[PDB]
Structure formats: C-alpha cells, structure tokens
Design an enzyme around this catalytic site. Sequence first.
Site, PDB file in Angstrom:
ATOM      1  CB  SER A 257      -0.957  -0.051   1.190  1.00 46.78           C
ATOM      2  OG  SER A 257      -0.319  -0.637   2.307  1.00 46.78           O
TER       3      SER A 257
ATOM      4  CG  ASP B 100      -5.495  -1.426   1.619  1.00 48.39           C
ATOM      5  OD1 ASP B 100      -5.485  -2.580   1.118  1.00 48.39           O
ATOM      6  OD2 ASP B 100      -4.901  -0.437   1.100  1.00 48.39           O
TER       7      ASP B 100
ATOM      8  CD1 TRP C 162      -0.578  -7.858   4.677  1.00 47.53           C
ATOM      9  CD2 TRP C 162      -1.712  -5.948   4.364  1.00 47.53           C
ATOM     10  NE1 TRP C 162       0.153  -6.832   5.246  1.00 47.53           N
ATOM     11  CE2 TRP C 162      -0.523  -5.655   5.070  1.00 47.53           C
ATOM     12  CE3 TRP C 162      -2.582  -4.898   4.049  1.00 47.53           C
ATOM     13  CZ2 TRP C 162      -0.186  -4.360   5.475  1.00 47.53           C
ATOM     14  CZ3 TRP C 162      -2.241  -3.599   4.455  1.00 47.53           C
ATOM     15  CH2 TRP C 162      -1.055  -3.348   5.153  1.00 47.53           C
TER      16      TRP C 162
ATOM     17  CB  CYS D   4      -4.634  -0.025   6.623  1.00 44.63           C
ATOM     18  SG  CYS D   4      -3.160  -0.555   5.703  1.00 44.63           S
TER      19      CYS D   4
END
Length: 388
Positions: free
Chosen positions: A169, A386, A388, A341
Amino acid sequence: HDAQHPCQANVAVRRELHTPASDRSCTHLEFDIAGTGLTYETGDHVGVYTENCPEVVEEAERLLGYSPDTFFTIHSPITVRNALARYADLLNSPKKTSLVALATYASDPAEADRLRFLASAAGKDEYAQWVVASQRSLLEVMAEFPSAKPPLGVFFAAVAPRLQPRYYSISSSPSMAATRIHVTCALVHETTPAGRVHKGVCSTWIKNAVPSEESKDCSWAPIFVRQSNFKLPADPSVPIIMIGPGTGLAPFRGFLQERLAQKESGAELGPSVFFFGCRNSKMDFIYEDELNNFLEQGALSELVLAFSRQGPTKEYVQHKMAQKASEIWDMISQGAYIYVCGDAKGMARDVHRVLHTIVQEQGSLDSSKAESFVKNLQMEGRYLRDVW
Ligand SMILES: Cc1cc2nc3c(=O)[nH]c(=O)nc-3n(C[C@H](O)[C@H](O)[C@H](O)COP(=O)(O)OP(=O)(O)OC[C@H]3O[C@@H](n4cnc5c(N)ncnc54)[C@H](O)[C@@H]3O)c2cc1C
Ligand SMILES: NC(=O)c1ccc[n+]([C@@H]2O[C@H](COP(=O)([O-])OP(=O)(O)OC[C@H]3O[C@@H](n4cnc5c(N)ncnc54)[C@H](OP(=O)(O)O)[C@@H]3O)[C@@H](O)[C@H]2O)c1
C-alpha cells in the site's frame, strides 16, 4: 505501465525503520519513477516483482537435475537458473494438479503411489495436514520423493506456478512526491510447523536492496500500480478516522502527506484522528518524527497510540478505541469516514468487533441493528478496509 506488465523502476532509497534496539525490521523504500509513465494516487497499491534467494534456487537445481546453462523459452530465451529465480514459485505449497504431474514422472512405484494418493479424494485429509498445514514447499515435497524428476517444460508448465508479485500500500502522496513511490515493508521471517526456516521472498529482497542513493550499481525491480478504492473523501471538511498499526500505517502516511499537500494550497482540514499501534516506543515506532510533524501542522488532529509490549499494559488500537468510544461516535454523526489497514486475521477482525460494540453503548442499538448499521457504513463507502 500495466498491471500484468511492469515497468523497470529503480530503488532510490532503502532505509531501516526500526531502531538498532528493535528485534525485528521494517524497511522504508522509494522507487524512482522519473521518466516512467507510471502515475499513482494516494492509497493505491504498488505491485513488485522480486526473485528467489540463491540458496532456494540452488536447492531446486539440486532437486531438478537440469543444466543451469540450458536456455529455453518460458511460455527472449532464459536460463534455468534465472527462470527459477524469477519465474518459479518454489516455496509455496504444490497444488494437487502439481502433485499429479510429479507422480507422472516418479519412477519409484511407492513414491508415485503416494503422490497420486495425496492428490486423490482419498488423500484430502492427509494433504491438508502434511502439505498445507505444515506449509511444506514444493522443494520439500520434491525432496520427500526424489524419484519425481519432471522435465523442464512440465516443471514450469505444471509443477511450479509463476512467482507472483507482492503488493504494498503506497505510503507517499504524488503531491509530496510525484517522482517516488514509497513503500513500508515488514521483513518476514517465520518457521513453518514442519520446521523450515522461511525468508519472505519480496520482503527480504526489499530489506537488502541497494538504493541509488548509496551506489550507482543500484537495485531495481519491475513495478506497477493498482488503483484502489482506499481513497480520502472529496473535501477536507469531512472528518476521517485512520486505524492501522504496524505496517498498517503505510497508506495513512500518504493520507497525511496528501492532507498537508492540499493544505498548503487549500482549505482548513477536517478533524483527523489516527490510531497507531506498535510494540515499543524505543523499537518499532516507525515514522515517529514524521508523525509529530504532521501534528505540529494541521495534517492530523490527533494521534492515539497503543503500545503492546512496552510497560505493564498490553495496549491495542481497539483498546484505545473503546476508551475514545464517545468522540468517535460523534465523528460518525458528523459524517466521518473510517479506515482500517494492517493484519486481516486478528486486528481487523478485532477492530471490526469493537466497532460494532461501540455503537451499541454510544448508540443505544441492539446487536442486529448495530450490525445492519455498520454494514451500511460499508455500503455507503464510509467504512474501508485495506488488510492482508
Ligand atoms: C493489498 C496489500 C497491501 C499490502 N501492503 C503491505 C505493506 O504496506 N507492507 C507490508 O509489509 N506488507 C504488505 N502486504 C503484504 C505483502 O504484500 C506480502 O504478503 C508480505 O510482504 C510478505 O511477502 P514476502 O514475499 O516477503 O513473503 P512470502 O514469501 O510471500 O511469505 C508469505 C507468508 O507465507 C508463509 N509461508 C511460507 N511457506 C509457506 C507454505 N508452504 N504455505 C503457506 N504459507 C507459507 C510465510 O511464513 C509467510 O508468512 C500487503 C498485501 C496486500 C495484499
Ligand atoms: N501473530 C500473527 O499471526 C501476526 C499478526 C500480525 C502480523 N504478523 C506478521 O508479522 C509481520 C509484521 O506485521 P506487522 O508489522 O503489521 O505486525 P506487528 O508489528 O506484529 O503488529 C504491530 C502491533 O499490532 C499488535 N497486534 C497484534 N495482534 C493484534 C490484534 N489482534 N489486535 C490489535 N493489535 C494487534 C501487535 O501486538 P503484539 O505483537 O504485541 O501481539 C503489535 O503491537 C507480518 O509479516 C505479518 O505476517 C503476524
């Protein structure tokens, strides 16, 4: 200049973000895009093509038995050694179709039977434990069955999948830096359940990249940009909440660069509140100096912190969210966007759960209404993740 197809960009700067006292590592890297058609927007992702470590490549060469001095056309010519470095995913776990292919070329009947078994329905539980759960690499499976000797074409066509690019990102705004793509990248270094020592493929490459700022013989990588919906609101008046800890900070650094960039040539900022979290103020407080500057100016209204290993208390971003549950609900009624995030399996889930709870106490709604309410911040585009 394409998601599928990359642009040879160079590494301009590469710096450690933790302190010498930190037990871990986090690299700050800047890709120089001057003279490249690449363009990027705040909150976008940059994909990076990397290569395998030489030890891993050598183990493959041992196992495969090819002449590394063979050139061949990967479906212009390339050597076996360079194909394994850059095109073969060697460390992830072989899919079942890949085991089928290894079996076809296994000259030991018992080894060939076991390979075919692990790929069959009868073997699904065993595959799940011995291959997937244990995170056994293609290279380990192959060592377990040394008679499996597939030909060069099959290997790249059916045994090893391509070495995917790794996404980061972007942590800079084009306004602050339209010539440089900024990445903030945790060094990955695990041990599998089966006890293999795994060096993250792209995060180790980044950690050790040579930047043009220290030598002419500098590192480079094919990069590309992926548009994301992780974007700031239309006008600065809208209040925003940013939540990510650790490398979850990355996009928000671009967010804060962008606020400020607009801020120099524009209107008053809306309140900005950023919840950050890390282990120790003296270890992994990445970008500390930059953050206080963003505060000295009007970029961010406030910076709550959560330190989870420093001091008696194990403090997480959501723990610091519940204490501030009053002010953030006010932020919601004022129309604030919320950004999350970072790690997806624990923090995002934990933060998501905390968010639902805060509305109940500060909103007076029951669990179902809260859920539907939060679901509706997402649909409206006000709750963004966002992870992961
Ligand atoms: C949209 C997006 C944004 C991101 N932003 C950032 C960011 O800003 N900063 C950042 O640091 N990272 C970010 N990431 C994560 C990053 O892209 C990589 O996943 C991470 O850096 C690891 O890359 P690596 O190649 O070094 O690790 P890999 O080599 O890909 O390893 C990944 C994991 O797989 C495990 N593994 C090893 N062997 C096996 C096996 N056989 N089977 C299963 N698992 C195995 C390893 O233990 C490791 O934890 C982002 C990811 C996404 C999708
Ligand atoms: N244990 C895991 O499964 C796990 C979690 C996150 C990241 N990682 C790995 O570690 C590497 C670095 O990732 P990173 O830098 O983003 O992570 P990080 O540096 O480990 O995390 C930063 C902060 O997040 C905290 N944290 C951990 N679990 C949390 C939770 N459930 N809710 C809220 N906060 C939490 C950590 O606390 P503590 O670390 O003190 O618990 C730490 O203070 C990555 O490659 C990632 O794959 C692993």
